[PDB]
Amino acid sequence: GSEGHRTLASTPALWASIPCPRSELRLDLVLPSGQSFRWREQSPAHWSGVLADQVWTLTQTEEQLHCTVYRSQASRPTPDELEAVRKYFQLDVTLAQLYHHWGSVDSHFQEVAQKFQGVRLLRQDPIECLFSFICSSNNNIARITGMVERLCQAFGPRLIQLDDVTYHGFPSLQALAGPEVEAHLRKLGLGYRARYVSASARAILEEQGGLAWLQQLRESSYEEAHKALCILPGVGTKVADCICLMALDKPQAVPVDVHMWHIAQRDYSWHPTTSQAKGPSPQTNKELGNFFRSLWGPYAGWAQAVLFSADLRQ
DNA sequence: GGTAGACCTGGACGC
DNA sequence: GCGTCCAGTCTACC
Ligand SMILES: Nc1nc2c(c(=O)[nH]1)=NC(=O)N=2
Numbered sequence: 001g002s003e004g005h006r007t008l009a010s011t012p013a014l015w016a017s018i019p020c021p022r023s024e025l026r027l028d029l030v031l032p033s034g035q036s037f038r039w040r041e042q043s044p045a046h047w048s049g050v051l052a053d054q055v056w057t058l059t060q061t062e063e064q065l066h067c068t069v070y071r072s073q074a075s076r077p078t079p080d081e082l083e084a085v086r087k088y089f090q091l092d093v094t095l096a097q098l099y100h101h102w103g104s105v106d107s108h109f110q111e112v113a114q115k116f117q118g119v120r121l122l123r124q125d126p127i128e129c130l131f132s133f134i135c136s137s138n139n140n141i142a143r144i145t146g147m148v149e150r151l152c153q154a155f156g157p158r159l160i161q162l163d164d165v166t167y168h169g170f171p172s173l174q175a176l177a178g179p180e181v182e183a184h185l186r187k188l189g190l191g192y193r194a195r196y197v198s199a200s201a202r203a204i205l206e207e208q209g210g211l212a213w214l215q216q217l218r219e220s221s222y223e224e225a226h227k228a229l230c231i232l233p234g235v236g237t238k239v240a241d242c243i244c245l246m247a248l249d250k251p252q253a254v255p256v257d258v259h260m261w262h263i264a265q266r267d268y269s270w271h272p273t274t275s276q277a278k279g280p281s282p283q284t285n286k287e288l289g290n291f292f293r294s295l296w297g298p299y300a301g302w303a304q305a306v307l308f309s310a311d312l313r314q
Numbered sequence: 315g316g317t318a319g320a321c322c323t324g325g326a327c328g329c
Numbered sequence: 330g331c332g333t334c335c336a337g338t339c340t341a342c343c
């Protein structure tokens with residue numbers, strides 16, 4: 001009862017609610033869709049993970065978003081802690097207004113958005129986002145998720161233990177820059193990305209001015225931010241866009257991957273026009289990104305998550 | 315400036 | 330069962 005992962009039903013007195021209609025958020029579509037790789041549905045309809053250096057389990061009813069925190073006597077999430085949840089899911093942004101707009105300007109979006117509502121963008125931590133996506137290239141969500149777990153367990157602070165699951169905070173820059181980190185990461189199966197992780201942690205801390213340099217990009221322009229990130233090892237056009245969209249408040253950033261190319265070709269009959277290549281290339285990928293922005297507007301990155309997410313269901 | 319491989323890993327085909 | 334295919338970044342020519 002007092003042990004293991006909690007459920008709304010099993011530990012009633014231990015959950016606080018946040019008004020949130022499923023029309024504004026569908027956890028089952030946001031948490032396992034490749035935005036963040038640290039949430040697990042440990043029990044049906046309940047998702048557990050680390051949010052703001054604390055462990056949480058979240059579940060939702062038709063109109064409520066139920067939250068519970070494990071921190072020292074077990075209490076309820078305070079309205080302050082709940083605020084941390086509101087910021088993570090950027091609940092101030094009205095998903096219904098964006099959907100309305102996108103659907104208005106894009107008949108196909110309208111058609112798809114009808115079956116996949118509640119897909120919004122999480123506002124992630126720069127460091128976690130950076131290395132998680134460095135791990136994402138030329139890889140599948142299943143592996144990435146495992147890789148990111150082993151990584152946090154090996155270099156991240158130990159938080160708390162539920163059942164046989166020990167949660168860890170995300171590794172720090174200093175830890176990731178440590179000696180023999182790449183070697184360790186390889187035995188952990190990160191493949192060649194093991195080097196990227198080490199090299200980018202080192203480069204940030206020893207050549208760019210550390211954490212402040214990264215956090216500063218949030219106030220910077222999208223074009224500036226994306227440009228800066230490309231500097232780092234293992235960070236190409238897509239990874240950079242993922243970071244700008246999900247961690248740097250650059251809502252118009254559109255990550256162009258294999259998924260978005262398929263969608264573009266199949267659902268909009270798109271073809272590169274200012275480029276000679278007919279397939280993915282640095283030129284055509286940049287163009288496709290412009291195409292979606294021109295299609296959905298300032299929040300192109302968010303609209304993207306809707307179709308991307310719905311494309312995963314296949 | 316603009317392209318062909320090379321690079322870890324492992325679930326998913328296909329024969 | 331074994332050999333592909335598939336889920337981006339980087340680099341060596343052209
Ligand atoms: N275009 C995208 N590429 C992604 C992604 C996402 O939400 N959009 N998650 C991910 O791991 N790769």
Ligand SMILES: [Ca+2]
Nearest residue numbers: 138258335336
């Ligand atoms: Ca590919």
